[PDB]
Amino acid sequence: MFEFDGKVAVITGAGSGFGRAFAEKGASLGMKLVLADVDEGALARTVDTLRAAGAEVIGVRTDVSNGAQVQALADAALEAFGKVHLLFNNAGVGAGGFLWESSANDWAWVFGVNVMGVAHGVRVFAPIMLGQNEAAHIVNTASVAGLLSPPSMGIYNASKHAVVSLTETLYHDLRNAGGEVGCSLLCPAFVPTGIADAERVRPEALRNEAQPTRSQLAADRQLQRAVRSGKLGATDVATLTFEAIAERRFYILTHPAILATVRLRHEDIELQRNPTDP
Amino acid sequence: MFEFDGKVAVITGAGSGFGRAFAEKGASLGMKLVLADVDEGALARTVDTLRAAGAEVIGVRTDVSNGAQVQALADAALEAFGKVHLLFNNAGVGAGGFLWESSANDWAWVFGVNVMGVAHGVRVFAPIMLGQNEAAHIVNTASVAGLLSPPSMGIYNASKHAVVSLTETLYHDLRNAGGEVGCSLLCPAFVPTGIADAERVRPEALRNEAQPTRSQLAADRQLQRAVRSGKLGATDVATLTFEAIAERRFYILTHPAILATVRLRHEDIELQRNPTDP
Amino acid sequence: MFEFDGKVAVITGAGSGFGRAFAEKGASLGMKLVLADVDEGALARTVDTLRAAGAEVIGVRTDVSNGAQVQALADAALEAFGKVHLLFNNAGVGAGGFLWESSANDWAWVFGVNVMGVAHGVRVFAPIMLGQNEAAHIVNTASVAGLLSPPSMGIYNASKHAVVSLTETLYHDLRNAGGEVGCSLLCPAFVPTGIADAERVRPEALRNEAQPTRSQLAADRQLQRAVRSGKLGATDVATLTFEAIAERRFYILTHPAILATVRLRHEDIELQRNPTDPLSL
Amino acid sequence: MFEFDGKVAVITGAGSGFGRAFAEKGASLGMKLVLADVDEGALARTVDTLRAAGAEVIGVRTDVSNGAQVQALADAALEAFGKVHLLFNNAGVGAGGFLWESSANDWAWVFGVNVMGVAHGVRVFAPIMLGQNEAAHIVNTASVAGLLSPPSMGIYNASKHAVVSLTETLYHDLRNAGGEVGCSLLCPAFVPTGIADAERVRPEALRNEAQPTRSQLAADRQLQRAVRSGKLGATDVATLTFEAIAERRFYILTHPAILATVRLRHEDIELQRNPTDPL
Amino acid sequence: MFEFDGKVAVITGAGSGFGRAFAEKGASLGMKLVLADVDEGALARTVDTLRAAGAEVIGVRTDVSNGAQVQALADAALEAFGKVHLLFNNAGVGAGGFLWESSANDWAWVFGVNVMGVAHGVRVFAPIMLGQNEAAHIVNTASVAGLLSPPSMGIYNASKHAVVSLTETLYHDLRNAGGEVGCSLLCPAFVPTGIADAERVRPEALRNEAQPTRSQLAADRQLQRAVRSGKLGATDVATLTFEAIAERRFYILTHPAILATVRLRHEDIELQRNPTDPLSL
Amino acid sequence: MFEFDGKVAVITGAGSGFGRAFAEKGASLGMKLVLADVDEGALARTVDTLRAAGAEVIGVRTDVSNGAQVQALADAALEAFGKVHLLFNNAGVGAGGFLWESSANDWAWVFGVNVMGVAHGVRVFAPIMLGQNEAAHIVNTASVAGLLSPPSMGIYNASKHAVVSLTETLYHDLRNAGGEVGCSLLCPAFVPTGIADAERVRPEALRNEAQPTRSQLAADRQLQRAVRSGKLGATDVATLTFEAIAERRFYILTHPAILATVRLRHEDIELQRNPTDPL
C-alpha cells in the first residue's frame, strides 16, 4: 500500500472545498502540506487553520492556469520539504448556459483552470516525481461531468472530459515509462462546496461585460441547488480519495449511484443513438 | 430529410483531408462553399480545384483558434451568400509523447485549434443559424480518440474528448432552445490525410526549442503508420458524414469496428477498474 | 508506346475541367505545357499552380473560335518550345432548350467553339506535326452527346456529332497521308466541371436580348444537376485519356455504361426505326 | 397518313437535284409550292416550268445560310399561301481533301449552308407550324455521310452528322412539346445531281486563293465519278421521300445497301475499335 | 441559561487548538474576546482573522506561568471591555518518557503552565468575577490524562490530575462563598492540535542540555500520532464546551468512550488493586 | 516477599509524624537509615534517639523542594551505606481556604514540597535503584486528599492528586522498563502528627504579608480539629505501610472507611454529575 507518514502533499484549490478537505486528511496521516490557491484570503485562512490543528504546512498563492506560477509552486515545495510525493491537481471553476451563449472569455477561463492547470501540474511535477525514485501519486479532480454531458454546462463538461482522458492516458504513459509514480482520477457528483460561486475568482481580464442570459441564470440557479443538496461532504470525498490512493485505484467514483446514468451515455455511443435525456 | 441544394456550407480545415472532401461532396449536392484554412497555399489550391469542378466557392484564410478571425469568416460567408446552413468545425492538429514531456506550447496549440476553434465556430455561427428560421446543422470533427485514451497521445485525446462532450451538450441545448438547428459528432478512426504532418501549421509563437524526446519521436512514427494505413479514404468519410446529416444522426462513427475497444473503456469505467490496455 | 516526357502538349480549355486535368497529368509525365483559354483568370491560376509545382508551362489567352488566335497559339508554342507533339482540342460550350427556341447567336456560339475551334486546331497544328517527322497525336473532345441525341440539347448534340465524324475522318486521312501523326476521340459522360456554366464565357456580341424560355431553364438546371453529380472526376478522364494516347487508341469512352443507349440509337438507325423515346430522367 | 393535296411546301435548293424533284412531286400531289435557291436563274427555270404546268408556285431567291433571308422566305410563304405544312431544308454544298488541308473558308461555307441553313429553317418555321395547330412536317436532307465517315470528306461528313443529330433531337423535342408537327431525316447515297459542282455557288467572301492540293483534286475526281454513277435518280429520291413522309417515318434511307457499312462503323464504336476501313 | 452575547471571554492558549476554537465559538455568539498566548505569531493571526470577520477582540501576549503577566491580562481585559464573564484557563504543554528520565526543568515547565497558569487565572480573575455581581464562569482544561495515568506521560498526567482536583475544589468553594460565579472542568481525549509540538514554546531557561532518551522519543512519536488522528476536532470540543457552560455542567467529557478505562482505574482504587496494566497501543 | 533486614531506607520528613514512625519501624526491622528533614533540630532528635537504640543511621538536613539537596541526600546515602533499597518521599505541607484567596506563594510552597520533592526523589533515586539490580521500592505519601476534593483545601488536594497520578504512572513505567524496582502510594486519612502546623517550616521567600481571611482561618481550625482526632497513630500507619511494602501492594489505604466517599466522587465523574457534597 501507499504510505503517507512524513510524505509531502501539494494541493491546489486548497483554500476551500475538496482541497481544504485533502489538506486536513493529509495532515491526519502525518503528511507535510504545500497548499496553493489563487484566492489569497482563503489560502491564508486555510494555512492558519491547518497550523492550529498541528500540521506542518506552507502556502503559496498560485494561479494554476499560469505555467510559471505552477513551476514556482514546485520550486517552493522542494525548497521547503525537499520532495513531492502527492499532487492534487484539484482547483476548478465553472460556467453554464446554452453553449453558444457563453463568451470566448468563459471558454478561456474554464479551460485555463480546469485543463491547463492540470496540464501544468502534470508537466511540472511528474518529472520531479520520476526523478526521486520513490513512490508518488498524482490525483486529478475531474467530475461526473467528465463522464456525462448534462445540458447547459457544456464548457464545464468539455473541460472535465478532457481531464478524464488526459488522466487515463497519463496512467498508461506512467506504466510504459516505468517507475513508482502512479495516478488517479476523482469523479465526484455534487458536494456542498464553493464551486457554485467560482465567479468570485474569475480574473479581471476575463470578465463578461454582458449581463447573464436567461439560460445562464437558469443554469447558475440549478447548479446552486445541486451543490447545496449533495449528501456526501468534502470530508467524505477526502476520506474516499485517500483510500483509493492507498490502493492505487485509478477511478475514484465517490457517488457510484451515478453509474446508471453513465451506462446510459455509454449505451448511446455503442448504439450510435442520438443522446438520451435521462 | 435535410436538403442541401442551393444551401451554404462553411468548412474549416478545407485545404486538406476531410475538409477538402466535405467541399467536394457539398459541391456535388449543389451547395455553395465557404472554405477556411490557416494554410494559405492549401486553401488557395482547394478553391481553384473546386472552381474547376464547377463549384460556387469563396476562400477565407482563417486561424480558427482566433475568435476574431472566426467572426470574420462568418461575416464573409454572409456577405457572399447571405446565409449559413452547414458548418464543419473540422480543422485539427495533434502532438504526441509521454504526457509530461510535452511543452506548455503543445497544450496551447492543440487545445487552441481542436477545442477553441470548435468553440468559436459554435459561438459565432449558432446564433446566425438560430436567427434564420431555416434548417441548419453543425458538424464537429472529434475522433475515436474522443472516445478512447490511447497511450502517448494524451493532449490530442483530451482535446477530442472535450469536443465529444461539448457537442453532446450542444445537442441537448439546441433541443431545449427549440428550432431547426441540429448538430452531429464525427468520430473517425485513422484515415490517410495530412493530420500526421500537423506541425506544418504550428504557429511560430508556439514552436518548441527543445528537440523531440524518445517517446515523442516514437509517437510521431506510430501516428504516421496508423494514418497511412487507414482503409477508408477522406472521400468515404465525406460520403458517410453527409448521409448522417441527411438523417440528422448525432453519432457518426465512420469506422464502427472500433466499438469493441470503446466498449472496453466503458467497461473499465462502469467497473471502476484500472484502465485496460487492449 | 507514345513517349510523353520532354514532349510538348498544347491544351485548349486549360483553365478548368478536363483541360486543367490534362495539363496536370501532362506535367506529372514531364511534358512542356502550352495552355490556352479565353477565361484569363482561370488560365492564370492554372498556369501559376502548375509552374509552382515545377512545370515548364506558358499560358496564352486564346479564343479558339478565332482562326488567327489559334494560329497565334501555335506560334507561341513553337517560340517557347520549338515543337508540338500533343494537341487537345478540348474547349467547349453548350446551350439547351427546345431546338427551335434557340437563337441564331446560340448556334453561332456553340458551333464556333465546339466545331470551328477543333477545325482551326486541326488545320493549324496538323501541318506542323506532319512536318516534324516525329510521333505526334491530336485528341478532340466530343462527348457521349456526339454518339446520342438527348432531348433539349440539339445544338450541343449536333456540334459533338460533327466533332465525332471529323475526327473519324481525320483518323483515315492521317493514315492515307502517312507518317507518325495520329488522333483520338474523347467521348465522356457527365463529369463535374464548369461546362454547365458556359454562359460565363459567351462573347458579348453573341448575347441574347430575349429572356430564357421554360424549356431552356429546364435544360440548364438538368445539366447543372447531371454535371455536378458525375461519379468520375476530371482527373479520371485525364488518366484514361493518356492511357488511350499511350496505346494510340482512337475511341475513348470513359463512361462505358453509356453503351446500352448508344446501341439503342444504332439499332434505331439500322432498323430504320423511329428514334426510341428516351427514358424519364 | 400525312396528306398533301392543297397543303403548302417550302423547298430549299429548288433549282436542281433533289429540291427540283421535291417540287415536281409536290406539284403532282396538288401542293402549293414556295421554292428557294440562291441560284436565281436555276430557280426561275424550276418555277416557270412548274407554273406552266398549272401549279401554284412562287420563287424566292434565298441564301439559306443567312437567317434574315430565311425569315423573309417564311414571310413570303405566309403572305402567298397563309400556311406552311411541309419544309424541305435541302440546300447543300461540299468540299473534299485531307482534313487539315482545307481552309477556314471551306469550313465556314459548308457549315453555313449544310448546318446553319437547316438550323435557320427549323428556328423560323417550327414555331409557325406549331402555332398552326395542323399536321406539319420538316424534312432535313443529310446524307449517308451523316451516318459514315468516308476519308477525304471530313468537313462534309461532319456537317451531315450535325444534321443527323439535330434532326434526331428535333424529333424528340417536337414530341416533348406536343402537337402534330413532326420531322424526318433523308440520308441518300450518291445520286446524279449538281452536288459535285457545288463550287458554282460558293459565295465570294469564302473564296480560296490557293490552288487545290493533290488530295483535294483526288477527292473532287472521286465525287464526280460517284455522283454520276448512282443508279437511283432525283425523281426516285423524291418518290421515296414523300412515301416516307406519308407514314411519318423518320429515317429515310433511299439506298439501304449502305447499312452494312453503317453496322461496321457502329460496331467500331461499340467495341471502341480503331475505325475500320471498309476498303 | 448562561448568556453569552455581549459578554467578555478571556481565553489562554488562544493562538492554536482548543483556545482558538473557543475564540471562534465565542465570536459567533457575540462575545467580546481577550485572547492570550505566548506564541505571538499564532496569536496575532488568530486575532486578525477574528477581527476581520467582525469580532471585538484584543490579543495580549501572556506567559500564563508568570503571575504578573496574568494580572496584566486581567488589567487589559478590564481596560478594553470593563468586565470579565468567561475565563478559559486552557494553555498547556507536555513532555513524555519514563518518569525518572525527565529533568527538573521538565517538571518546572509543565507544572508552571499546566498548574500554575490555571492557579494564577483563578487567583486573579475569580475575585474580579465575584465582585461584579453578575453571572460568570471559569473553565479549566484538564484532559482524560487527569482521570487516568497512561504510561510515559507522568509529568503531564500529574499536572492534569492537579487541575482536575483544584477545579473540583473550586466548584465547592464557589458554592460555599455564594454568588453567581461557577466553573467547569474540560477533559478531552486526543484532538488534532499543536499540543504534541509544545517544545516550540518551552522557554530558553528551561531547555534540556541532554539528548532525548529512547523512551522520550517513543512517547513523543506516539503522542504525535494519537493527536493528529483524533476524530473530533477543536471546533467540536468548543461546541460541546459551550453547551456545557450554557447549562453550567461541571464535568465536560467530550470523548465518553474513555469511560471504560476510567472505570478500570476507579475500580483499581476501590478494590485496592495494583494498577491494571494498560492494553498495547 | 520484599525483605528489609540489612537494607537501606531513605526517609524524608523524618523529624516528625509518619517519617519518624517509618524510621522507628525500619530500625526495628534491621534497616540502615538515611533520615532527611528541613528541620535540623527535629531531625537530630530522631537520629540521636534511633542511634542511641543501636541503629545504623545518618541524618542529612534536606529541603526536598531543592533538587541539588535531594541529589546530595542520595550522595550521602550511597557514601555511608553503598545502596538504597527503600525510599519514602514523605515530607509534606499544606494550606487552606477558598481557592482564589490563596497567594501565589501558597501554591509555590505546597507544590514545591508535595510534588517537586517527590519528583526530585524519583528522578534522583530511581536510576540508582534500577542500576543496582536488586529489589527496591519507592513509597510516595499522598493522602485521601489525593483521592477526594474536600472544600477549602484545593491547593493541598491538587498537590496530592498529582502525587497519586505520578506514582501510578511510575508503577507502569517501572514495569515497562523492567527490573525489581517497584513503588507504592500511601493514602492516609487524618492522623495526629505535626501536619496542621506545617507553617513552621514555610521558607522565608514564600511568606504571606497579608493577614488570613475568614475562610483560611476556618480551614485551619477544621484541620487542627480533624488531625488531632484521628483514631490511628503514626506508628500504626508505619506498621500498615511496611506490611504493604512486603507484599508489593500499590494502594496503601490506612483508613479504608473513606472509600464510600471515594466511590461517590468516582460516580460523579462516571455520570458527569456535578460534584456531590458528601455533607
Ligand SMILES: NC(=O)c1ccc[n+]([C@@H]2O[C@H](COP(=O)([O-])OP(=O)(O)OC[C@H]3O[C@@H](n4cnc5c(N)ncnc54)[C@H](O)[C@@H]3O)[C@@H](O)[C@H]2O)c1
Ligand atoms: N463540489 C462539487 O459538487 C464538485 C463536483 C465534481 C467535481 N468538482 C471539482 O472539484 C474541484 C474542487 O472544487 P470544489 O468543489 O472544492 O470547489 P471550491 O470552490 O470550494 O474550491 C475550488 C478552489 O479552487 C480555487 N481556484 C479557482 N481557480 C483557481 C486558479 N486559477 N488557480 C488556483 N486555484 C484556483 C478557488 O479559489 C477555490 O478555493 C474542482 O475541480 C471542481 O470542478 C466539484
Ligand SMILES: NC(=O)c1ccc[n+]([C@@H]2O[C@H](COP(=O)([O-])OP(=O)(O)OC[C@H]3O[C@@H](n4cnc5c(N)ncnc54)[C@H](O)[C@@H]3O)[C@@H](O)[C@H]2O)c1
Ligand atoms: N485523419 C485521421 O486519421 C483523423 C482521425 C480522426 C479525426 N481526425 C480529425 O479530422 C479533422 C481534419 O483533419 P484531417 O485528418 O483532414 O487532417 P489534414 O491535415 O489533412 O487537414 C486539417 C486541416 O486543418 C488545417 N488547420 C490546422 N490548424 C488550423 C487553424 N488554426 N486554423 C485553421 N485551419 C487549421 C490544416 O492546415 C489542414 O489543412 C481534424 O480535427 C483531425 O483531428 C483525423
Ligand SMILES: NC(=O)c1ccc[n+]([C@@H]2O[C@H](COP(=O)([O-])OP(=O)(O)OC[C@H]3O[C@@H](n4cnc5c(N)ncnc54)[C@H](O)[C@@H]3O)[C@@H](O)[C@H]2O)c1
Ligand atoms: N463535363 C462534362 O460533363 C462533359 C461531358 C462530355 C463532354 N464534355 C466536353 O469537355 C470539354 C471540356 O469542357 P469541361 O467539361 O472541362 O468544361 P469547363 O467549363 O470546366 O472547361 C471548358 C473550358 O473551355 C473554355 N472555353 C470556352 N470557350 C472558349 C473559347 N472560345 N476559346 C477558348 N477557351 C474557351 C472555358 O473558359 C473553360 O475554361 C468541352 O468540349 C465539353 O463539351 C464535357
Ligand SMILES: NC(=O)c1ccc[n+]([C@@H]2O[C@H](COP(=O)([O-])OP(=O)(O)OC[C@H]3O[C@@H](n4cnc5c(N)ncnc54)[C@H](O)[C@@H]3O)[C@@H](O)[C@H]2O)c1
Ligand atoms: N446528290 C447526291 O449524291 C447527294 C447525296 C447525299 C446527300 N445529298 C444532299 O442533298 C441535298 C441536295 O443536293 P443535290 O444533290 O440536289 O445537289 P444540287 O447541286 O443538284 O442542288 C442543290 C441546290 O442547292 C442550292 N444551294 C446551294 N447553296 C445554297 C444556299 N446558300 N442557299 C440556297 N440554295 C443553295 C444550289 O444552287 C442547288 O440548286 C444537299 O444537302 C446534299 O448535300 C446529295
Ligand SMILES: NC(=O)c1ccc[n+]([C@@H]2O[C@H](COP(=O)([O-])OP(=O)(O)OC[C@H]3O[C@@H](n4cnc5c(N)ncnc54)[C@H](O)[C@@H]3O)[C@@H](O)[C@H]2O)c1
Ligand atoms: N489536543 C489534545 O489532544 C488534548 C487533549 C486533552 C487535553 N488537552 C489540553 O488542551 C489545552 C489546549 O492545548 P491544545 O491541545 O489546543 O494545544 P495547542 O498547542 O494547539 O494550544 C495550546 C496553546 O497554549 C500556548 N501556551 C503554551 N504555553 C503557554 C504559556 N506559558 N503561556 C501562554 N500560552 C501558552 C501555546 O503557544 C499554544 O498556542 C492544553 O491544556 C492541553 O493540555 C489537549
Ligand SMILES: NC(=O)c1ccc[n+]([C@@H]2O[C@H](COP(=O)([O-])OP(=O)(O)OC[C@H]3O[C@@H](n4cnc5c(N)ncnc54)[C@H](O)[C@@H]3O)[C@@H](O)[C@H]2O)c1
Ligand atoms: N497527618 C495526616 O493527617 C496526614 C494525612 C494524609 C497525608 N499526610 C501526609 O503525610 C506526610 C507526612 O506528614 P506528617 O503527617 O507526618 O506531618 P509532620 O508535620 O508531623 O511531618 C512532616 C515533616 O516534613 C518536614 N518537611 C516539611 N517541609 C519539608 C521540606 N521542604 N524538606 C524536607 N522536609 C520537610 C517537616 O519539618 C516535618 O518534620 C505529608 O506528605 C502529609 O501531606 C498527612
